[PDB]
Structures are given as C-alpha cells and as structure tokens.
C-alpha cells in the first residue's frame, strides 16, 4: 500500500565528509519513520526512530529529519566506521515498507595491492582438479582486473573473482582470483603467472610460481 | 538480555513447504503493544517486509505473498512461526525476525531487536559438504581454500577464534558446476611461521560437516 | 490522653498512611544506629530523643518531594482524562455519519460508588487493571486507525 | 497536520501518560473483538470506528475513577507531611530541654531540584526508597518512645 | 502459608546448655516492623514472655532471665535461636516462638502466629522408651496403656488417624518411680469389635520409639 | 517493668450465658492490649487486638473493651466451644507481660459416669508388675473419687488418677484410675473391684472382674 523510495542508491564520500541520504513516501506516514544501518550479512542496527529521535548508543554524527513524505538522514563528520547500507522503513501502516537502501562507500588515497600467489595444494592435485589463487590485499579503488598466464598463454573461462566488502579499518578491498584447471592441465604446463592491472600501479605487475617449488 | 533467533532449513526443494521458527527471550509476546515481524533479504538485495503478528493475534501480511503465508504464535514457548509453501528459487533469501515493541507510544522504536538471520536456499540440488585445502607461501600470506559445497553458507575460523587479526575471508562464488567456493587468508608475518600454528576451522552447518587443515609451506 | 499516648497515636496515624502509599542512586536517608541511644545496647532517654527530632526534621525535606510526586500523578491522571475527551471530539468529527452510544450519567454514579466501596487491595488492583485495559484498547484502536 | 495525523499524535500523547502512571474482581472493561471490525480478519472502516468511540466513552467512566485514586494519594501524602510537622511539635514540647538541628531551607531547595532532575525510573525508585526509610525510622523511634 | 516451628532437645541435664531454634516460613525477618519472640509455659501454668528480636537486631529480654539469655537471628535461613545455659528444673516448660508484625501500625496484632511448642524437661534421668499393653472388655470400651517412659510427651494415634471418634486420651501422670504413664481409650460399639481392627499407634519422639499393639478380648 | 493482673483466675458458666473477664495494668499501656485464647496444650489463638478490635475469624460473641489500665473481655452467648484459658498481654513496652490467665469451664446437667474396668494385660503380667484401669467416661461435674478393693480389702498408695480436660463437645470429663500392683500381688488375690463415688449416682456403684475371665 505504501512505497518508500531512497535516493541515491549508492554514495561514496571521504573520512570527515558529510553524507546526505533522502527517503520519500508515496503517502504521508507522519513522523513514524525509522532508519536502519546494515553491515554486510549482519542484521540491521537501529539508528533513528520517529524521523529525528536518536536510538540509544548511536553517535551524535547521525541525525535524521523530516516529516510527512520527505525524510533525510545526515552523517556530519564521516568516519570509516560508517561503511554500510542505510535503509528506510515506514511504521505507520501495513505493509511496513522498506526503501531501496543506500550503499555508503568510503574514499581514500589510491593504494597499490599486495599481491601473492598460492599454488595448488598437494591434496587437491591428488584428486579431480587443481586451483591457483592470486591474492590482492588492501587496495583502493575496488576497480581491478586479473589475467592468468599458463606458459605465457592467456586464459579465459577458467577463473573467477571474489572480493571482500570494504574493510572499514582502512577503506581497502581485497581480491581472490581463483584459476581452476584439471590435474592433467596442471601437469601439461610449467609456468603459472598472475597479471594484476590496478590503478595504484605504474605497470601491470605480474607474479608467478613454478610447478617445482 | 533480549534474544531472537531464527530456526529452519537451509535448503528447500521447489514446490515444498518452508517452515521457519523464531524463538525469542527477554520479552513476552503477550505484552500490550508487543509484536514480532518477519523480514527477508535476498543475497545483495534490499529488504522486504513479509509478515507481522501482534499481541492480540491480529496478524498482518505483505499483500503480495499472503496466499502462501500463514503466521502463528505460541506465547507459552516464545515462538513465532512463518510458513511458506510451494517454494520457488526466486524466494531464496536471508530470513530475519524482528521485535516491534511499545506500538502506539513515543517509544515505538520499530524493529529494534533482530535475529542473526537464516539463509534459505531453494534448489533440488542435494546438500554437499566442503573440501578444504591449505594455501602456503617481511610478509608472505597464507590461507586455505574451501571448495565444492552446497548450499551457502560456511563458517571459517582461524585457530578456534584466537586469530582474528589481519583476516580477509572472501565471499563464496557460485561455480558453473553449481557448487560454491571461497577462500580465507590471514596476513601473517614471515617471522611467526615457524613459531605459531595456523589452522583453519571450516564449519558447514547445512551438512553437519567440520574440517580442520594445517597450513605448511614447501 | 497523656503525653506518651498522644505520641503513640500520632505516630500510629503516620505509619498507617505510609503503608497506604506503598500499596542506581546513593541517597543519604536518616537511619537509627546503635550509638544513637535508641537500642537496648545503650538506651539513653535523651540522646535517642535528640536523634528522633533531628531525623524527622531531616526527613521533612523528602516528605515535600513525595507530595510533589503524587501531585504529578494527580495532574497526570487528570490530563489523560481530558485528552481522551478531546479524542472523542476528534473521532466523531472525522466520522460525521450517528449510531453512537453515550453512557448513562447516573449509571456511572452508581458504579463509582461501588468501585470505591471495596477495600484498598481491590482498589489498587482495580487501578492496576483499568490502566492496562485502556492502553491495550488504544493500541488496538490506533493500529486500525493508522490503516486509513 | 491532517485528520489522521492529529488522531495519531493525540493517541500517542494519551498512551505516553498511561505508561507514566503504571511505573478477586470480575469487572467488564471494553476490549477489541474480531467481530468489531478492527482486525484484518474482517476490517471495516466504519464498524471499527463505531466500536472505538463507544469503547472510549464507556472507558471515560473509569478514567474519573483513576483521578479520584491519584487525588486520594495526593491528599494522603499531604496528610503524612502535615502529621509529621505536628509530631515535631509534640516531641519538642515533651523534651523542653535545645541542642536541636534545623535543616537549611536553601539546601533543601537545591536537593529538591536534584531529586526531580533524574528520570522517571530513578524518581519512582526514589519515591519507593523514601517511604521505606521513613516508616522504618518511625518504627524504630516509636519502639524507643514506648519504653518511657 | 505462615509457619513457625520450634526445634530443640526434649531433655537437658542440670547446669547444661539449652539451645532452641525457631525456623519460620511465609515472612522475612528483614521486613520493617517484623519481629520474633519467645514465650514459655510451664505445665499447667500461666504464660511468661522471655525474649524478642526485631528486624534491626534490637534485641529485648525479660529482665529476670537476661543473665542466661542470648538471642540471635539469621535472616538468610529464617532462623531465630534462643540459648539458655545452666538449666534448672524450675525452667521446665513448653517453649513457643511467636511472630510480631507491623509493629507501629494499626495492624500490630501482637503475637498473631505461634508454633506448636516444644516441651523441654530438665532432669538428669535418662531417656526411656515406653511399653504398650492392650486393654479389652451396647457399649464396652477398649484402649491401650502406655507406661514407664521419660520424658514427656508421647503421641497416641488410633488406626493411623482413621479413628478419632469417641477417643479420650488421658494426660500422663508422673509415677513416684520417676517415669510417666498414660492411657488412651476409644468408646466403641460392641457390634464392630469383630469387624473393625483397633490398633493404637504409640510414638515417643524423645527416644525415636514407635510401638503398635493390637487390642483383642478374652 | 509492667505487671498485668487478671480476675477471676477461674470461671464456670452455662451454655448461652455471658462471661466477663477483666485485666488490669500496673501502668498505662494505652489501647495496645491483646487477648489470647488457649486450648489445653495447643498454642494460643488470637482473639482481640488493640483492646476492642477483633481478629479475623473470631466469632461476633467475643468483644473486648477498655483503655489505659482497665480492660475487659466479654463472651455474649457462651457456646461449649469456648472452653479454654484466656490470657492478657500488653504490647506497649518491654517486657510484653502476660496476665495470670482465666480458666473458663462450661456447666451442664449432672451426668453419671459410664464405668468399665480393664484387667491387667497378658504382656504386662508376663513382666515386672500389673496395672488395673478403671474407666469413667463422660460425667459432670469433674469432682469424683475412686476406691479400689482387692478381695474386699480397700487399698491405699497403689493407684493414681488421670482426668481429661473438659470435652467441649458435651462439657463432660473422663477419669482413668490406674491401680499398680506387683505380679505376685495379682496372683495372691482373686477379686478386683472399682468403687466409683460421683454426684450423678444414687449409690457408690462398684464394678469388678475376676482373675479368670
Ligand atoms: Mg494541584
Ligand atoms: Mg484536591
């Protein structure tokens, strides 16, 4: 019956910056509006209740405002601890509809990734397939690409990427590019290299280990 | 201490009953103005309010799903049960239950207390336990690889929780084979490799599987 | 009556009223100690009387606090009484369409006499029950009222 | 504000005051039933409003009872306040021999502001503690006073 | 339910410590205005108030016996203990403990709750269990004789309490030998002598002696 | 410090009669006076508190009055259930002194005793001594005397009397005269008779059993 709409759907700001997130209602819900903060996977945490009243324990930098159909959440001096998705819920009438959510990202100076490679394990090789993992730790921005080379032959369709959510301790990300081959493919070649293309590098740095190490 | 915890299956076949149970402690659902609701969140998606039951059994639902939704309570065991039948793969999500208290007063905080949430996967694929392999190299990282399991999720602890510093656990990626795969690494100094013991504790509750692997170089 | 008898009946009157009211903070309230002379372990007819008059005068401050608390509850109950009367005018004005029942004024007078005729445990219980039934009634009403 | 908003904030005001008051008998108090139309199992925008206005008017009788109970407690607390003042005059007259301490009037004014500055749970607790300490003080005093 | 029960020895040697314990339930001795007192009653004599302890440990005594009297309380176990030392045969009595509540109010009922009372005999004579003999004859009575025991009292039940109608139990008479003797009879119809079973249950707690004797004529 | 005195120390009245028991104080105890009712052996039962206020459950026929030093307990229409000793206690100042107590007895029409005799038991004879018991059930007044005859020889120093307290069911008493002899004395004689002298008899009735019965 009620539709809540949030804008923007995503936001990126620096530490010490100010963040503005708005939420509109299809019909008036008076001041009965509630903001939530959600970390990845974890359950939401209560921030503001009744539009402008602060829940116990919430820092003073969080402040909501508005009534009727226009509502706004404001973070005064942004800390890296505030990395989360912020949701909007009206509690006036059923259904207690949520908003689309606003993903808040933290900015920082461009950081080069710390790259290390792990070879396939002995137990995995003594089985069906093999997997080579390229670890890229603590870099920003999240935008990055990883290419795999096997005997100087670029691969395709053999790898998948996994990225952590933004580490609120330093606003960095981490990548895990896993190259999956068969046991016969790992024996048919010798050299295995990971090619990292990231903004924090002057050149696409390549790491590699050999079959006999 | 207020505690709400969800309980239910991590895997449901299509067109098969899903029965979720929310057990709470620290408050009575018979209290005036008290209520318990159900809210779900598909992986990486926005929240969707599902149902709600009040102290006087005046049950409310999301109008889009009321056909397959039946909520009920038992105030003598502190249990709220939401039942979804004829499950579809579109309704795979993390299912939360939340507490609504002091409804009409200036202390209507909203959903002020939530549970951890239960990840519900809907697929005819069977449950499979994971396989764990170590990853080994003034810092050279280490970790271990948890591959080929179903369904999500797993839990990876390092040294039984004694090691949490510098740990980057990666989310699972659904392989084209249909099984999940993830890795968990620890940024360690190369000085403590021969002093401390680095073992990862992999726990996959949907299959009651628990695996421990020691990480050593070569 | 005599001197000690007027003291006894006056204290008996105060003690009865305190029980009628009774149905972290580190505050210093006067207490009776062994050295004050009001015990058998050293009973002093004058040292005890000095502590009694002193303690009661130092208690007289907190008695004014209690009257302010119970007056606040009297002003609180009278506010709920009048705020409900406005809530009636608000709802009937929004209705404007009347199959309305209004209670009999003399039936209410007969009930108020009966409600107050029972003893204090029943009246403290009745006060306890009226508050819960009215708040639960409003929460059920407000929920349906918000669905409009 | 609009019609539904004035209803919501007026009820929210009444509900807050009831919680501020709250800290066999078979009585008929209005309750909300399924056939009254205020539930999802049969929601009627007019049948529910008829039951709301009726139930509140039938509740308005018991609201006058509550004001009489809290006024009785206000008159009760003021009686203990004045009966203690007479108890002072009784005791000092029986003494007639004065090393008497009288509290500072402005020190009491500073304390009353602090006692009432804390929140309601602390003040309901303070009211709870003052009553017990004063009755226990009188019972200890009366016991020593009867031994004379 | 309010219960006060006395506990102590039924026999004390002369110039030897007497320790009585009153255990109560249903109220807290820490309550303002609450108190527990001790009152004794020599056999067939008037009451004599002994001691009293208030909630604030302000203990009071009868001025005549304060030299040998020490009362104390333990509010965590609900126990009041009165200790009499150097006992004399003049102080043989039934010892009661009573509850004094709401001291200064208009509800100061006085000693409104009492215990059963403990009979305390003071003598150097040793404890002896009784000997029971039957007594057998439109009514001819029956009964049984409880003779030669020390100290008082005993308990005589008929058919384990099933028979209380027409029962006349006589008080003990101190023989010149120093031992007590009593009899308990039942006025029965001569019709039920061959139908019902008439057995007396003699119980002498000071010696943990329990005797049962069947009554039959000849 | 305080002395309470009751008068009379004993009293006897009929059923439906009025009873007056007074209690005086050596010094004023205000209205803080408490009356108790005590059955034989059992613990006292509360009747009146604060001189004239009735404890819960006490029948309306009990009514106390007085203040200062003069106090009075009144039983309007006496029932046989009221057989007890009534005590007087001041609760003003320690010591909480009791009165001497007033023993209340109930009057009734003179009743003749129902006399039966029991011979010595087989087990008692097969031991040290022998005992003959003369039972006198349900008689009034309590005044009675019992003589023992052994082969028509009156005895002395060989018997003791035991009397029940007044049976409040019918205001009667019961006697138990126990004659104790040695085993040789019981064998040296044949006839054993109990001589009952009571007001309810026109002549001193004698009962007897023989050795071989
Ligand atoms: Mg006023
Ligand atoms: Mg007034």
Coordinates of N, CA and C and ligand atoms in Angstrom, one line a residue, chain C residues 71 74-75 78, chain D residues 74, ligand 1:
Chain C
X71 N 1.3 14.6 43.5 CA 0.6 15.6 42.8 C 0.8 15.5 41.3
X74 N -1.5 13.0 40.1 CA -2.8 13.5 40.0 C -3.0 14.4 38.8
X75 N -2.0 15.3 38.5 CA -2.1 16.1 37.3 C -1.9 15.2 36.1
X78 N -5.4 13.5 35.5 CA -6.4 14.4 35.0 C -6.1 14.8 33.6
Chain D
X74 N -2.6 11.9 46.6 CA -2.0 13.3 46.8 C -2.5 13.8 48.1
Ligands
LIG1 MG1 -2.7 20.6 42.1

